Design a protein around this ligand. Structure first.
Ligand code: OLB
Ligand code: OLB
Ligand code: OLB
Ligand code: OLC
Ligand code: OLC
Ligand code: OLC
Ligand code: OLC
Ligand code: OLC
Ligand code: OLC
Ligand code: RET
Ligand code: RET
Ligand code: RET
Lengths: 228, 228, 228
């Protein structure tokens, strides 16, 4: 339900995350080695967090109304950003641990990621239309850099590893590039930006993106020989 | 002194934390060795945070009214959660460093702790009654997970340590298990939950729990041979 | 344009931070060595964050009104604290890495820093007049601690290093001591505290302090042979 029917995607999203989390848990019951176990922990925590955010939004807590200087009223699920603030660095940690990136490089990307999510949240909450777009632009620029550094810096880090590790890395990297690049488009075409689509469409789009980026990614990671 | 006299416990809690903090600082003045000193820093910082949160609540900052969909109006001291968000991980850090747990395991427990505190805050703040209990359940589940991993993972980590360190670990573990397990019950019986007791009783109970969990714990930790 | 003209300093602040960030980026383009690279990443991220913060304030995001129990109504840019919450630990990381301080000493300063910024935020937002000054006093006390530890603990850590590093460290330390010490004074003389000056003057003062503390500090750090 929700404001305009979009709660269905919230509920499905919850269940989806919850199913993936349970699958991951079920997958790691028989694992002793600490590094593999670390990948389990991170990758279980990610959809746990996303399931809880989704559930909060289904119930109406992740939701505030914002009145723009436009007179335009926008229905804002801000719990997304809460979710994103924690799960995107964890996803970066996951693949960075896969890649054998240094503490330094992971920290760098996480810093950039955090900047990206917070300036996104400002873009979403600000009443000034020009501010909305300026911050969407700042956030997207930071995203472009994050994705470049992911490719160059983590790719270099993974370049001396075995074939399975490099292969899994490349798969996960491409999942990040494609799915993560779509989020700013989604923001632009949904109600928060140009409102070409409404809340229902936008919510469906982010449900699909989140499911791919968290459960799809998690599946690909946790099944690899690379983490083993 | 608050909405219904509970400020007196807010005042006593403040004073108690402060006195604990002062004792610990005074206890640590001559400490030179870095690991021991690290236990002092963490264990001083905890009641400092809690003293500051209690004082903010005493002044009414960090108190909000929440009107539930039931119509019931609840007086919510949310700054407690801010306090907990940082202090419960520090407590876990404290016992982890005592146990000789790895960076990974500690991070894991901090993760699940964070999940517990945040979902508990959602439980406290959401207007939808079924949601309040759903989130309380999610949070309590995480608590059980957390406590189990504390016993099994940190207990296994400490199992190769000397007798003093094992015995201290067992004391601190038992403090956490007993006191921390009561918090969700307190929430349930207090005004955010079943409202079997009013704001005053609940504030008293959390004051006692907080004091044992921070000052009692701290005292037991810092007086041990184990950290020297 | 601001509430009372202070927008001019928000804009000039935005621009100076952005130019500092771009200068640092230009300067670090060929840097290959990992350790110097870290200094670049941190020192570039600091004015990035501060620039985004300034821009948010310029657009009126991050500005609330607080009605005090006195009846005074205060125009409070709270986004500053958001800014400070992240940049001040990073500044501390930057100099700690320069000083060769341990993870524990750095974490310690970051923890007391965090305490300082959050208690200052409480001071800024609380409606209770006595509480404003109580938290300002708490915060300033922790600042004094932080500065002493910075001098004693980072000074000892840096004491075994080469002369270039000790000298650069002493330069950066003195910038922190002098500029950081002025902030609580600025809070006290400005509209949040005794109101001896208005929002325009206070905003100007913080702009100058922030520019020195971030771009001046970053310049001195990044141009030193010590980090290369
Ligand atoms: C009003 C909002 C204005 C924008 C606020 C943006 C706040 C988010 C930005 C940054 C927060 C994340 C900071 C991340 C800080 C990362 C520090 C780092 O690079 O560590 C490297 C070491 O591990 C190497 O050994
Ligand atoms: C009367 C108000 C009581 C509640 C507010 C208390 C605020 C905390 C008290 C003073 C501010 C400074 C807190 C500073 C907290 C940082 C931890 C620390 O104190 O380290 C001390 C070192 O010597 C350890 O080795
Ligand atoms: C106008 C208000 C906003 C000003 C800042 C907006 C642009 C911020 C810049 C980058 C976004 C990420 C935050 C800064 C993160 C910098 C990390 C880095 O590795 O920098 C590499 C560069 O030096 C190129 O090699
Ligand atoms: C806004 C909040 C954003 C953060 C949210 C939580 C995400 C934490 C991610 C990484 C933990 C930091 C430590 C990263 C360690 C990387 C692994 C590593 O460095 O391994 C080699 C090292 O030598 C082994 O001790
Ligand atoms: C709401 C208030 C939040 C307040 C901030 C909470 C987050 C604390 C973050 C890091 C501290 C980690 C504990 C410090 C671990 C190292 C301690 C140490 O060894 O310190 C040595 C130094 O030389 C002498 O202090
Ligand atoms: C993200 C949700 C809010 C979290 C707020 C946390 C506040 C700081 C308290 C604990 C963190 C300690 C650092 C992270 C965990 C690593 C612990 C560690 O550094 O352990 C070192 C030890 O040497 C290994 O054996
Ligand atoms: C939107 C409202 C509802 C939101 C509900 C979710 C809110 C965040 C919950 C938990 C924070 C998780 C922080 C995780 C910090 C890192 C922990 C970690 O990395 O643990 C594994 C370790 O690295 C190797 O074992
Ligand atoms: C008021 C009540 C509130 C709810 C409180 C619920 C009880 C606490 C939950 C879990 C801790 C107990 C964990 C039990 C398992 C300990 C770990 C373990 O048994 O590990 C294997 C063992 O070593 C093989 O001999
Ligand atoms: C109130 C919210 C809680 C407080 C929020 C604070 C946010 C800090 C963010 C970035 C700085 C992170 C600095 C982490 C420094 C850890 C110590 C370290 O990395 O030391 C390495 C050593 O120099 C070689 O091994
Ligand atoms: C699991 C959560 C994920 C993968 C979240 C990804 C979010 C982004 C890549 C955010 C993108 C944004 C921009 C880069 C522009 C501003 C709007 C945002 C926040 C949607
Ligand atoms: C020093 C502060 C401490 C030890 C606080 C501990 C708090 C908890 C263990 C929280 C418990 C709760 C649940 C597990 C269910 C939701 C209600 C909470 C947040 C009180
Ligand atoms: C880049 C920003 C910097 C370096 C800001 C530092 C800010 C402080 C050291 C603030 C100190 C304050 C007090 C000590 C008292 C409370 C008022 C504050 C927050 C301004």
């Amino acid at each position: 339900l929700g404001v305009e029917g979009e709660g269905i995607w919230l509920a499905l999203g919850t269940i989806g995350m919850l199913l993936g989390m349970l699958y991951f848990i079920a997958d790691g019951l028989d694992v002793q080695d600490p590094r593999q176990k670390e990948f389990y922990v991170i990758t279980i925590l990610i959809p746990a967090i996303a399931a809880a955010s989704y559930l909060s939004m289904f119930f109406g807590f992740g939701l505030t109304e914002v009145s723009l200087a436009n007179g335009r009223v926008v229905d804002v699920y801000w719990a997304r950003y809460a979710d994103w603030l924690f799960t995107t660095p964890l996803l970066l940690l996951d693949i960075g641990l896969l890649a054998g990136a240094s503490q330094r490089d992971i920290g760098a990307l996480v810093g950039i990621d955090a900047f990206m999510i917070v300036t996104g949240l400002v873009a979403t909450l600000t009443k000034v239309v020009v501010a909305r777009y300026a911050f969407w632009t700042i956030s997207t620029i930071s995203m472009v850099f994050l994705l470049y550094y992911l490719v160059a810096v983590f790719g270099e880090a993974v370049s001396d590893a075995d074939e399975d590790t490099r292969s899994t890395f490349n798969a996960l990297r491409n999942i990040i590039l494609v799915t993560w690049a779509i989020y700013p488009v989604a923001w632009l075409v949904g109600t928060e930006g140009l409102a070409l689509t409404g809340l229902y469409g936008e919510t469906l789009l982010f449900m699909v993106l989140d499911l791919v980026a968290k459960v799809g990614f998690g599946f690909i990671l946790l099944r690899s020989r690379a983490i083993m």
